[PDB]
Structure formats: C-alpha cells, structure tokens
C-alpha cells in the first residue's frame, strides 16, 4: 500500500512527489460530493456515491468555473492566482498530502482558499502542501467549493437556489476529512482548518455555524473575518441580486421556478459574464454573491451570535498583513496604476474614499476624510496614495477582524495574533503596493524552501518560523513550542509583528483607526 | 502747562508720574460720558456735559461694579484681576499716560479690557500704560465700560434697555479720544484699539460695527474673537436671560417697563448675586450678559458680515497663548485644583467635555472624545488632563480666531499673527497651567521692565520686543521695522511664536483641531 488507501467511499491510489530531497504521498482529486451540474446547480451539494476500483488520484482536479483576472495578462504577480487547470462545474474534489513513511495518527490541516467568494482554486502552487507536509510532518488537504453565482446565489425561499450552497460544500469536505482521515494517518479529533481572505471569512464561519462546530478542532484565519462587510448579504439583498441577474440574462422574473430554469439552461460563462453587473453600488472591495445570512447556517445575525458566545470555543490564530488596500485600490480605484507610483490627488483621493465607503453618507464621507488627511500637508500625493491604501485596509480586513478577535476572546479557550509586514524580496508588484493582501501564503506554503524562487536566506528561516507556527498551534493549540508569542487579552492586547527581524511583541493593533470604524462611524451613519 | 490740557469739554489737571529713572504725564480719570446712574441705568450711555473749572486728573477712578473672584483669597494670581479701586456705577471714566515733553502728534493705542464681559477695570497695574507711554513714546489711553447686566441686559425692542450698551460706551471713549488727543499730543488718524479677551473681542466688534469703523485705524486683538461662541447671544436669548434674571429678584414680569422699573430699583450687589444663575446649562467658558446680535449694531449675523467683507480693512495683529483653557477648567470642571497636579480620570475627563461643549448632542461630543482622546492609553490622568485643556482652548479661542483671521485676510489690508507660548518665571499658577490666559499682557505692558518684579533678564529683552511690534504695528501698521515676522496669507499661514528664544515662523496654526471645529463639528450638529 503506501499510495493504496481503502476509504470509506472506495479505493484510491496516490503519486509519490518529490519533496526537496526525498518524496511524499499526494492524493489529488479525491471527490466528495456528487458533481453539481444539470439539474444540480445551485443546490446544496450530495454526499458521493461510493465508486468500485481504485479512483486514480494522481493529477489535479479541474477548477470551478470562475472570472479569469486578466487585468495584467501574462503578468506572473496576477496569473499565479488564475486557474490552472480546467475550469468546469465538475470541480467538486479534494487533494491530501500525506508524509512517507504514512504516520498513524497525526495533525491535519484543512485549507479553504480565498478569492472574494467569486475566485479560487486547490491547486494554485501557492497552495501546493507538499513543503508543509513534508517539513512539518502533517496530513495537508484542500477543499474546493463552488464560488461566485454557482455558490452562492440565493433565492431564500426556495430548495432549488437557497443559499450558502458553496459553504456547505465545505462542510462536505469537513465531512469526509472527519470519517477518513484516518485511514491516510490523520486524526480526525485535531484537525484545524485555516483559510485567507474568503477562507478565513468562511473559517469564522464554520466557527459560528451550529452545523459545522463538530467537525473541526481549532482554526486559523488569515485577512478575513466573517463579521467583514463584504463577507455576507441578507436574504433580501441576496434575492435582490439573484432577479437581478436573472434580467441580465433576460430570464423570465415571474418566479423562483422559472427565473432558476433559466439560470440552469445558460452557459457558465453568461453567468460569470454579467456577473459584476448585479452589485448595488460603485464599490471597491464588495463582491456580488455571497454568503447570506439566511437562519439557517446562521441561526441570527453575526453580531448576536458575537455578542452572546453563541460559537465554538477553541483557540484561534489569526492576522493582518500590512498593505491590504493595495490590491484593491490598484485594480479598480481612480490613479492607480502598476507601473506608475499612483500619487493621488485630493480630487481622485475623495474619488477613492466615495468607492471605499459605499454606504456612507455625505457626512460619514467627511467623517473618513477627516481622519485620514493629514491636514497640514493635505495635497501630498503619496500621503494620499498611502491614506486611502489604510482606508481600504483598515474598514475592510483590520477593523472587523479586531471586532471578531475582541469578542471571541470573551469566551474562546486562547488567541494569537499577528501582523505580517514583509515584503517579499522578489515581489513583482511594484513597491508602493508593500506587503500586499494574500502575500504571506508564500511563507505558510514553505515556497521559499524552494531555492529556484529566488528568496533570502533570511526569508527562507522566516517560512520555517511560520510552518512551525502553524504547525504547532495545529497540534497543541499554542504556536510556542515550551520568544513566546504571547496570548491576546482584552486587557493588554498584544500581538507579533511576523518579519524576519527580531520578533516584537505590541499592543492595540490600530485601536485609534479601529474605534473610529467600529464605534463612531456606525453610530454617525445611525443618527443621520 | 505740559499737565494743564484744554480739552473740549474742560480743562484738565494731570501728574507727573515716575517712570523708570525719569517721568511722564498721567491723566486718570477724566470723564467721557454722563455716570449712568439712576433713571439711566441699562441705556445708552450720554456724552459727558462740559465742565468748568479744572477737571482734577491725579487719581483712578471708580470701578464698575462687578463680581469680585474670591475663589482663592489672598492669592495674588486671581487679586492681580480684581477691581482695585471702589466699584460704583458712575465709573464712565478714560485714562491717559502722554510722554514728556509732551509731544505733538504722535501714535495712540486705546486699551479696551478683558474679563468675559462680567468683570474689568482699567485701574489694574497689569494695565498701567507708564512704561508702554515712556519705552515706545506713544500715547495711551484705558476705556471704561459696563459689564454684566448693567451693561449687556438686553430686552430688544426697548429704549430703555437695549442691549450693548456696555459696546457704546466703548464708543463714545472712542469718539471722545477722537476728538480730544490732539490736545495730548496724539493724533487722531493714528490710534490702534488694543484689547484681550473680551477687549480683543470687542476690538474685533469695533471692525464689524459701521458706526465704529471710522474712530480708529488699526486694531490688536489678543485671545479674543469676535465671533468667538462666547461673546454673543441672538436678540431671542438676550431676552431670555433678561427676564430670568428679573424672576430670580421676583421682579413683576408682565412688561419691560415693570421689569425695568423693578431692576432700576436693586442695588446692584443684588443683580451681581443672581447674575450666574440665569445661564441656560451647565458650562464652562460661558458669560450671561454678553453683546446680542441687535441688527444695530451688527446689521447682520457676523457670520455674513465675515464672509462678505462687510468690515472694516486695515491691518491687524492677533494672537493666541498656548494654554488658554486652563484658567477655565481650574475655576470649575472638576478634578482640578490649583495645589494638585490635576490628573483627571476619564469620568472627569468626559464630564469636562460636557461642560466645554454645552450645544453639542451625544453624538458631538462622542466626535470630541474620538479627536482628543489617545486610543493607546484611554485612562493616563495626565493625557486627559492636556486633552482638556485643548479642548477648551481650541474650541473657545484658537479655532474662531483662526476663522477670523482667514475670513479678513481675504479683504483686510495685511495680517500678523502670534503664537505666545512663554511662561513667566514668576508665575504662581501651577505648572501644569501652562502659559496662561491673560498671561501676555504682563509682557505687552512692560511690566518686566520693573526689576523689582522678579523677572529674568530675559524677559525683560521679550517684553521690549513685544512693547516695540507692538508700538511699531500701531504706528506703520508692520510690527518689523525696516527677523520679519511675515504677513498671514492665506495660501501660507505663517505665524510667529513669541517666546525667549529665537524666533521661529511656523504655519497653519492647529489646523487638525482647528477643521474638526470650524468645519466638522458643526455640520455634524447640524445633520442630527
Ligand atoms: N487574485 C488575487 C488574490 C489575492 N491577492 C492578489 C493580489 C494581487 C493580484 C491578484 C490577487 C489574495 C488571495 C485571493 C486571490
Ligand atoms: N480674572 C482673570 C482674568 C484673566 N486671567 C485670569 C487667569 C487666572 C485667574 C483669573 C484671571 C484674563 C483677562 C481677564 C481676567
């Protein structure tokens, strides 16, 4: 055996890969649903019927059909987070790593991709396991799950379209990772799931959702919270963009049954076509479809089930990284561009703060605008380059992740936090772009172990430090071996900065910024 | 002669007074209007009948009657401020210091006093004009005028108390230096009105009246504004505390001429006793009976009038003292007291701000909290102690002074503006006060000159300084005889600080604070 493994479901037959200087088992593909196509689309997804023989697991599955980002074509810093294989609605399947000689019960270590809910894929090679299953010695796997229209449309009432359709094929995954992981070495009563941007929004949310506490034991979350404003819409609004596809495909809108048919009758690529249509507003760093909070998955709102510990209580690990906005701003804000070094004007600055706050009011407008401009030096480009890069940043990922982490605290059994702010050496996005939004995963991947990427040595001791971390706090629950990383308390809020120098420990990551979004603005945006 | 003057009401006596190591003439106490006693109280003031004979000018006259400050009896910081002399209501009276030998026509600076509209006399030896008269060789003259009720009780549409009429009386001494200081030597085309607190607000008043703009040429206005929300009340308010002020004595309140009748008749003592009762909250920095917007006097709201130029266009020279709050929070928000260090506690610190913004709503005063609060150490008793005091100082004096300032630049005709941050050596205040409120004045009237007084040397170099800007702007309308201290302009804001040291030009005096303010602030009051 070795590559031979009897699961519940059926056989499956492995590849070793090689690891460095050695090798490694990988099962990629394993299925866990049944393929959500024809009459499938938009339900929730079926349990597997088990197959006879041996399922062959030696190549990638396909990716879920979803918008190819071809802002920069052929530009590496862009394309390695496209699809790499083919797209399909088949796309349902899982991918484990698994150490050589197989171990007999050892920590696993589940990732749930990111992508804003309407991207993603398993088998990026940012996310290849094999380094941290082999360096760290753990079972690695990866979901998939349908993003975009196909995951997450949501015609509340109805069994056809309800939604959350995509978060519950995580769950499946969950599912088969709890009833046999076992049979690949893992032990199914420690396995963490960690996930960035969306995945960390979706790890709070299997935190949160009664349906899915049991199937995990810890988590991680990277850039995303599930309580961020991007991360969830109600059943009105979810419904609201569901018609409102459906007329940009000139569906028939007099019912569920029939605006659905018609969504089940056109091509993938129609649905991803219009599928940015559909938004309520001019906006950056807002997405269309989404998790809805529908009573189901969430009994209430997040904010309750926040403020009454109506959630599982374990230890958590997450962070921030330093230049969110970047990538946003970049990509869809007036003044941006790659190659330039986008100083903002005041008239484009105001431009981008009317994107970033797409709910405020004149006056919330001003409210920002007064935060973050340096009024002795009000028109600096750069300065306003570099504000509006925090205003993105801290409304959308650090402010509500300090929300989460505060709350959860209260009542969760230990928190690690931390803030990533290196820029990788070999970085091909340009400077003014920092530590750019999804960039740590090179280090929590161990690509820098691979000497062909071009990494400092120094960056190379860096991804170990991380690995182990995460390693670590996957077993025992605690990132520290027995300097500390200390724990975060409300009281003295502390936190690591996680970059290749001497490790500092701080406090209050960006409290003056974070009331200002999560006490003041709210309450200004209220009373108008 | 040279202390025998004909004046053209009558002749007048003076003394020669020692000055330093030689003398001047002194004229204390000459009339310029009939004592408004009697059947007179709360009007107009009347222009002085001639008189025959010889006025006797040797001695000070009566102060107005005021609340004397007995809240730290004895001690010398809070004495140095009360009248020093026996009040009475018959105090309509103007000083003058004139070089020998008399000279024969030469620079005039009139002294309008401080006290928030309540308390002030010109006898105060923090105003004796020796040393400015002798050291710069100009003429200088003190005004009298009412304060409290008997000088800003205002029932609106009645002759016989109309309001502001404490601001006449500064008229009429303006007209009576008009039309006299040529017989001392003064000439008429040149005399600057000087003025702190509420003389600097006055002065500013004095610019925005068309019946004023003609009895003076330049102006000076220290620590006061005239559209500071302290100096004056809507025509609506005035009667309010008007008739509040007559049920605290039981007065018959079915008409003005009852309740006139009825406040003619108190002795004064009474109406002082009752005078702070009639404020309609809890605040700080807040006076009773202060100028009312009558439609005579201004003809419109000062707001319009600043924004349509509709005043007078000279040059002007103001300033502000780096701790202006001080003083305020000390004599009544609680937690500080003079032989403590004042730490408040964030209890205090939010009660304070209660007192220091008494319009704003809830919200307002969450937006006070958010700006002057240091997120990073919430309860350090020091930082909220500070913070106080900038708030009082910049919502109270800095931020309408800077309003001020750019909406005459845009018309006046040259702008100089200081930053007065020294502290005395022989301040008896506490340290943690700061350069005080009315602290300069010691400075601009030469009393460091006397070596008596205990002041280094270097002081004595800063208050030739500043008795020389100072003569020097009254004469040219520059304070830079031929390192300039640049004009404010509003493009680059430049200002001067006025300490030992040498001089440093900065620029946008507390601009942050100041748009939180002058721009923020009130539009969020204004939405809610
Ligand atoms: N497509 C991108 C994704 C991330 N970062 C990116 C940064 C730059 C350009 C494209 C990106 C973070 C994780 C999700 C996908
Ligand atoms: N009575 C006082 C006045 C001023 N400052 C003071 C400061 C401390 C105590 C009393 C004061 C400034 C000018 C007006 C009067």
Redesign the interface.
Known sequence: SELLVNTKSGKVMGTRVPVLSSHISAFLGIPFAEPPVGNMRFRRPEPKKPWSGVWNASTYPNNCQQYVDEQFPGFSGSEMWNPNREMSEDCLYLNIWVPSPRPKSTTVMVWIYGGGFYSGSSTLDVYNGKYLAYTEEVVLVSLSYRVGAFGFLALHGSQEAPGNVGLLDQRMALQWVHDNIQFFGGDPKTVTIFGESAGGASVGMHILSPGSRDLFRRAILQSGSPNCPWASVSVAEGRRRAVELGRNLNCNLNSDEELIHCLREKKPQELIDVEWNVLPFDSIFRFSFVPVIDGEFFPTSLESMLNSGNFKKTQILLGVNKDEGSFFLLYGAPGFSKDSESKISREDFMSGVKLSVPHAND?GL??VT?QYTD??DDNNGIKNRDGLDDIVGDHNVICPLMHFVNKYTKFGNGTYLYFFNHRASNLVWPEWMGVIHGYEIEFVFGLPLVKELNYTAEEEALSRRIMHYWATFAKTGNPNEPSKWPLFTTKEQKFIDLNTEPMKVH??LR??MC??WNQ?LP??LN??
């Open positions: 006056l001003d409210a007064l009024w002795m406090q209050r409290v003056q009331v200002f003041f309450k200004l009373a108008t």
